[PDB]
Amino acid sequence: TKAARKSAPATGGVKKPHRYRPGTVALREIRRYQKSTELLIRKLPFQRLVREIAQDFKTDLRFQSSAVMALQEASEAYLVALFEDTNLCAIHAKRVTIMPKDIQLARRIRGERA
């Protein structure tokens, strides 16, 4: 047995975690990275990587420290340049995402693929 209690609707509404929509993070990255001028690849792995590959061509190559960072910068710009044009190939097919068949096509038109 329960008396006729007056009552009001109770609720449990709570805050919603916030998630940015896909892509808008990247756009923020583009501007900050284009403005940014520092190198992007972790510094240490390259010095091991260059030593490993160089060992094939010859043995016992002590590497001058100054000569090291050059390879990154040269490779970086080469990679960066090789990247941007890939978008133009990608957007040309009306897509937005790049796939390796494009990076192959792009390296052909430059002539380097052959």
Binding site: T1, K2, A3, A4, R5, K6, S7, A8, P9, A10, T11, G12, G13, V14, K15, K16, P17, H18
Partner: protein
């Protein structure tokens, strides 16, 4: 101690410190210093709490100060098992994840975007610093709207014989939608005795018991304020809404629509349909169509 100068105070302190054990005099700083406490992590915790138990949305428990002298704020936490946040009165430390984060709604802690408004909790004075909840506690007008019950900015009412039945309540001044009105004061009594008093109530068709939460019912039969005489209607200009204030469950009334001078106030008692016919069957309505 004006009875002694600083000498013979320090000296007797030497005498006392020689006799009694020296004081601990310990200080701590805790590992956490700043950041690493993004409030979205708190959103995960209540998401957990909502999914396990608070999905029921019927077991409203009165706040109880959980004590954790050396325990963490684990699943054994009384507030945790009570499906409710740890209040600042709890012994859960200043790092408890069940405590409220702080209610930083800039314009007014008063709308759907206000989590505190979304919460059943009124934005605490020490928390909604952006709506001035703490600011000018002496003053009556603040930017916030969900801080009134603390300040008790009640409106002025009038007592008159209601058209529906006997005495009724009339408002002195015009108000708009969702505007704060006077609280429904009363006395704290347990559910089981509310049955007994309610059992006594039905013998003379009285109703002054309000189901405050799952654990308590408030009564205004003997002690209360004027609003207890409000009538019933199925299409009211006012509605009841439970709220959480400083660990105290309270019920307020707000205008369901904008209201002009001299209106008669109504709200739904929300009993059963058969019960509604038993007590509040009068509807005072002509059918236009």
């Amino acid at each position: 101690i004006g009875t002694k100068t600083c000498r013979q105070v320090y000296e007797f302190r030497v005498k006392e410190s020689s006799i009694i054990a020296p004081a601990p005099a310990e200080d701590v700083d805790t590992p956490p210093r700043k950041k690493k406490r993004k409030h979205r992590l708190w959103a995960a915790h209540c998401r957990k709490i909502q999914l396990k138990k608070d999905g029921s949305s019927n077991h409203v428990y009165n706040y109880q100060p959980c004590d954790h002298p050396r325990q963490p704020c684990d699943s054994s936490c009384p507030c945790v098992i009570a499906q409710n946040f740890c209040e600042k009165f709890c012994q859960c430390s200043s790092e408890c994840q069940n405590r409220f984060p702080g209610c930083r709604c800039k314009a007014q802690c008063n709308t759907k975007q206000c989590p505190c408004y979304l919460a059943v909790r009124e934005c605490d004075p020490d928390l909604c610093l952006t709506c001035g909840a703490a600011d000018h506690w002496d003053s009556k007008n603040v930017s916030c709207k969900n801080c009134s019950i603390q300040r008790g900015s009640k409106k002025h009412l009038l007592l008159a014989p209601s058209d529906v039945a006997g005495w009724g309540i009339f408002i002195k001044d015009p108000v708009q939608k969702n505007e704060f009105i006077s609280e429904y004061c009363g006395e704290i009594i347990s559910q089981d005795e509310a049955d007994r008093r309610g059992k006594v109530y039905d013998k003379y068709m009285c109703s002054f018991l309000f189901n405050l939460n799952n654990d308590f019912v408030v009564d205004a039969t003997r002690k209360g304020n004027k609003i207890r005489f409000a009538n019933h209607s199925v299409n009211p200009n006012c509605y009841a809404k439970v709220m959480m204030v400083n660990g105290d469950h309270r019920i307020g009334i707000f205008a369901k629509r904008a209201i002009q001078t001299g209106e008669e106030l109504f709200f739904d008692y929300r009993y059963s349909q058969a019960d509604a016919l038993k007590y509040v069957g009068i509807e005072r309505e002509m059918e236009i169509p």
